[PDB]
Amino acid sequence: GFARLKRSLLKTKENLGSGFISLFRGKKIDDDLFEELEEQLLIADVGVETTRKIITNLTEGASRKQLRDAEALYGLLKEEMGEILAKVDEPLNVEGKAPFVILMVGVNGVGKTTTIGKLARQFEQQGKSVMLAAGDTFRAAAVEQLQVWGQRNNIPVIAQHTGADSASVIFDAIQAAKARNIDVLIADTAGRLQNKSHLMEELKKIVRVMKKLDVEAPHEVMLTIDASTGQNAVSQAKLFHEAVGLTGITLTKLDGTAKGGVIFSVADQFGIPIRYIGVGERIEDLRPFKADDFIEALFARED
Amino acid sequence: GFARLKRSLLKTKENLGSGFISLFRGKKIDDDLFEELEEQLLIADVGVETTRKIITNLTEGASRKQLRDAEALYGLLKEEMGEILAKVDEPLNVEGKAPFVILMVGVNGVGKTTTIGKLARQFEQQGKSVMLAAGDTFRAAAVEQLQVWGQRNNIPVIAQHTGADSASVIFDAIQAAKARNIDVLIADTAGRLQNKSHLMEELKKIVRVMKKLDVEAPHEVMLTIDASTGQNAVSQAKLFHEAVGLTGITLTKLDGTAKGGVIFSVADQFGIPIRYIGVGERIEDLRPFKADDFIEALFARE
Ligand SMILES: COC(=O)c1cccc2[nH]ccc12
Ligand SMILES: COC(=O)c1cccc2[nH]ccc12
Ligand SMILES: COC(=O)c1cccc2[nH]ccc12
Ligand SMILES: COC(=O)c1cccc2[nH]ccc12
Ligand SMILES: [N+]
Ligand SMILES: [N+]
Ligand code: NA
């Protein structure tokens, strides 16, 4: 519930949300204050451009409202930062397709594989049938890990030999899922970053091949990024958004990091819906993102 | 988006907003349709006159564009109902007064006392000093409760003996608030249901006595009404508005009632800013009313 969400964000709340209260207590609204607040936002990984927007809007709103007390900045900041997250607060709906195809993109080692498993279990718990495609075809250990997980959870995993063509594996998986009236297909992909131009090509190849079987596929292109990696997450988002058309973002490992500010940078810089946030180890701790619950937990205060 | 507001509005969305979607599915635009729509608005507690206005504008707007599929009324209805709420979209500003005096009026048992406490905590979290006046002077248990609350929250509460003259308590509270550099004074009042002319004269007396200390007081005359009381909320607004001039409204208990559509009747009939809506038990759940947020949650497909 909500109480677990608050507890999971305590390290980010040191600096953001309720963490602002001690910064404002008894201060004057002046440049020294906005400079300290700028610094605190940047340290939290909110990012130069998004921080500049927040500070600018706050400065203007403070003047317009003729505020006297720095404590009164808290509500204006909660509105400003809430608005950033509200603009990307569109939940993923996987209903009504045969299969709904999720193309999972992102670097290796940011919770991409974990997210695939948790989403698969959530959809199954909802009464949907799920299939996986082991599209990261040149990493033999990762394929075998998806297969073993599929074998442990009674979920089919389509896979070919090491070095198979990723687009062919995923083509075969869509074909299989359509014939078995599978509700949701979740397709892994390679996450090696060196060749940006290569990445755009392998992903564009995957998408084109998909569309030979279903012009609507992929129905979702989901990036996974790790919030504890700070601005590396922002740069990955930039890379994959320019590389392929993203329609959804999952941000993992929000719990236990003081770098939870990166969600605001991702929301503001890209405007792509944030579908899920990972706030713990449990299957259900991959939460459908709710901007309002998120903001309330971050800004929760009991004074 | 707006997941928490959608849930607080779940019962209201059965009849309004997204609840229109099933009503229009696959229908043609004709008299039967507008009749079905009028019925659903009335069931949603939008009120006879406000419903007639909506249906009128919708009809003519539908003929002009020669619309045929009832599905196309949805966007027009969202505009019409959004315009109604946008007219009372104006957040309360309490800055710059010494003190800013809020006179809290309404009947007992509609969230008036809860609203006082939530506002007080919000203003103190904003860096303001707050004081309360226990003006509901013949209800000894209500007064003592307010005092105990003030003691728990380190907020002063001005009170006199049971049966004291409410105008005297509030006069003394303004005097104390001015001496103590209080930023916001929130004055409770009686909300007993019998002898409504009696209560109205008491309120006018309170206002006249306040003005002995500050002719701008009360800076806000706030009605509290409970959305679960449906059209009784509208009749309460009319009564209190006629006796003293309301300047703001707080509509409580939107969560869990199917009659949240009464907000449109309140907005349309009086044109008084709705400052706050109560959408849950938390201090933060007394939310500043933002009309576009409310419409989006109501009319959202998802
Ligand atoms: C909870 O962690 C997982 O879901 C998981 C762990 C190890 C391998 C996995 N492969 C897919 C999900 C998964
Ligand atoms: C076996 O055929 C495939 O896996 C395949 C892969 C990529 C494009 C394709 N087009 C037809 C089959 C096919
Ligand atoms: C925050 O809740 C209240 O406003 C409240 C709860 C219980 C008793 C109260 N008395 C005044 C406010 C109040
Ligand atoms: C205790 O209240 C007063 O002293 C009082 C009440 C109503 C009108 C008043 N005018 C001057 C004092 C006063
Ligand atoms: N009172
Ligand atoms: N009293
Ligand atoms: Na959302």
Numbering used by the authors:
A (entry chain B): 195 to 497
B (entry chain A): 195 to 496
Published text:
A 100-molar excess of Fragment 1, 2 or 3 was then added to the drops containing FtsYNG crystals. In the Fo-Fc electron density maps of the holo structures containing Fragment 1, 2 or 3, we observed medium to high densities in the IBD in both copies of FtsYNG. Nevertheless, it is clear that Fragments 1, 2 and 3 bound at two different sites within the IBD in both copies of FtsYNG in the asymmetric unit. The first site is wedged between helix 1 and helix A and involves a stacking with the indole ring of Trp343. The second site is located between helix B and helix 2 and involves a stacking with the aromatic ring of Phe365. Interestingly, the Trp343 site is located between the RNA and GTP-binding sites at the FtsY-Ffh heterodimerization interface whereas the Phe365 site is situated in a hydrophobic patch surrounded by charged residues involved in RNA-binding. While interactions with Trp343 via π-stacking with the core ring structure are observed in the crystal structures with all three fragments, specific interactions with FtsYNG that are unique to each fragment are also observed. In Fragment 1, hydrophobic interactions involving the CγH2 group of Gln339 are also observed whereas in Fragment 2, H-bonds and water bridges with Gly311, Lys312 and Leu340 are seen. Fragment 1 displays hydrophobic interactions with Val403 and H-bonding with Lys406, whereas Fragment 2 forms a water bridge with Gln354 and has hydrophobic interactions with the aliphatic groups of the Lys406 sidechain. The determined KD values between FtsYNG and Fragment 1, Fragment 2 and Fragment 3 are ~100 ± 20, ~100 ± 20 and ~480 ± 20 μM, respectively, while that for GMPPNP is 280 ± 80 μM.
